[PDB]
Amino acid sequence: DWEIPDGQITVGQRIGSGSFGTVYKGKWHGDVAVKMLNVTAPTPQQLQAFKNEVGVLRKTRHVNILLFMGYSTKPQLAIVTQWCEGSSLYHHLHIIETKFEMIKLIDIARQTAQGMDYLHAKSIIHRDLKSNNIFLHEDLTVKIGDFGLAGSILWMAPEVIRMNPYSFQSDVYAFGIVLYELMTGQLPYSNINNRDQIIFMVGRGYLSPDLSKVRSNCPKAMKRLMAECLKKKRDERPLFPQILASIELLARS
Ligand SMILES: CC(=O)Nc1cn2cc(-c3cc(NC(=O)c4cccc(C(F)(F)F)c4)ccc3C)ccc2n1
């Protein structure tokens, strides 16, 4: 069982704080990441969200998924995962501007599609895939998780922006935005400074990511796949088995 024996987890540095909880770098058979709910006594809705999160996490065992390690309920509700080395894909692309070679970019894409295909096969809809939720462990392996504590409308499919509108296809749209980030090094709609206007326009189908911005060395097949994933009509979007087969085919070139 994944219930960690009481008084074994040690929490060190606080590495993230929000309203959905606090994340600390801890110690439990080496470095771990510990997510805790700040309140000493929780709401029955909080206990349920904890149970639901452990229910999803305990179902996952794949190299491209952040490793769930266990949970504690005493003294506080805590979820323990592995401690990664490096930074998020968001950090690489948008903050430290890491210039990865095309072969490496296609690899990050393949590994993300690999983890997304795993989640979808286990009937897990991520609901918040974005480059911040894609960790580049040892600067080599994609680890997908939900690293947040709170939103992020750039990866939101038009029907999610409108109004349950979450599906395998809405995750595919967010994956298309990630491909856009990888192939352009940029976030979409960088020339618009109004949040509400982006929300309104994506939702109405007036605004769409500018594909003319993709790198010169970006394969023709990659540009096609990106456009397919970003289709305003969700039923028109390919699923991850097809996405992965498209990435693996163009990789042999
Ligand atoms: C350097 C380094 O390692 N930093 C680091 C590690 N961190 C780990 C967490 C963290 C995340 C969760 N939950 C999920 O990830 C989650 C939830 C729902 C669905 C899915 C999915 F499987 F659908 F993806 C995944 C639980 C507990 C912790 C400790 C948060 C921030 C963080 N920062």
One DSSP character per residue, 163-176 reads -----HHHHHHHHH
Distance CA 226, CA 177 (A): 8
- Number of residues assigned to the chain: 253
Distance CA 21, CA 97 (A): 29
Residue 16 CA to ligand 1 center (angstroms) comes to: 11
Distance CA 147, CA 8 (A): 23
Distance CA 250, CA 211 (A): 18
Residue 154 CA to ligand 1 center (angstroms) comes to: 20
For residue 177 the two structure tokens come to 């935005």
**Which method was it determined by?**
X-ray
For residue 243 the two structure tokens come to 């996405």
- Ligand 1: which of 147, 149, 168 to mutate, judged by most atoms within 8 Å of the beta carbon? 147
For the beta sheet containing 68-72, the strands, ordered from the edge strand earlier in sequence to the opposite edge, are: 10-17, 22-27, 31-36, 78-82, 68-72
Residue 203: count of CB within 10 angstroms of its CB: 19
Which amino acid, one-letter code, is at 91? H
Q: Where exactly does CATH 3.30.200.20 map onto the chain?
A: 1-85
Distance CA 247, CA 225 (A): 8
Residue (of 90, 72, 84) closest to 15 by Cα position: 84
Q: How far is CA 23 from CA 18, 89, 148, 202, in A?
A: 9, 19, 9, 32
* 22 assigned to a ligand binding site: yes
Distance CA 108, CA 179 (A): 9
Peptide bond connecting 75 to the previous residue in cis, omega within 30 degrees of 0: yes
Residue 90: count of CB within 10 angstroms of its CB: 20
Residue (of 88, 99, 108) closest to 222 by Cα position: 108
Residue (of 203, 128, 111, 117) closest to 170 by Cα position: 128
**Residues 6+ away with beta carbon under 8 Å from 247:** 106, 109, 110, 113, 222, 225
Residues with a CB atom less than 6 Å from ligand 1: 16, 23, 33-35, 53, 56-57, 60, 65-66, 79, 81, 83-84, 119, 124, 126, 144-147
For residue 163 the two structure tokens come to 């109004």
Distance CA 185, CA 171 (A): 20
Domain 1-85 class? alpha beta
For residue 34 the two structure tokens come to 């510990």
CATH superfamily assigned to domain 86-253: Transferase(Phosphotransferase) domain 1 (1.10.510.10)
Residue 62: count of CB within 10 angstroms of its CB: 16
Is the sign of the CA dihedral 72, 123, 243, 164 positive or negative?
negative
Q: Where exactly does CATH 1.10.510.10 map onto the chain?
A: 86-253
Q: Are 13 and 83 in contact (CB under 8 A)?
A: no
β-strand pairing of 78-82 with 22-27: unpaired
* DSSP H helices in the chain: 44-57, 89-90, 102-121, 158-161, 168-184, 195-204, 220-229, 240-250
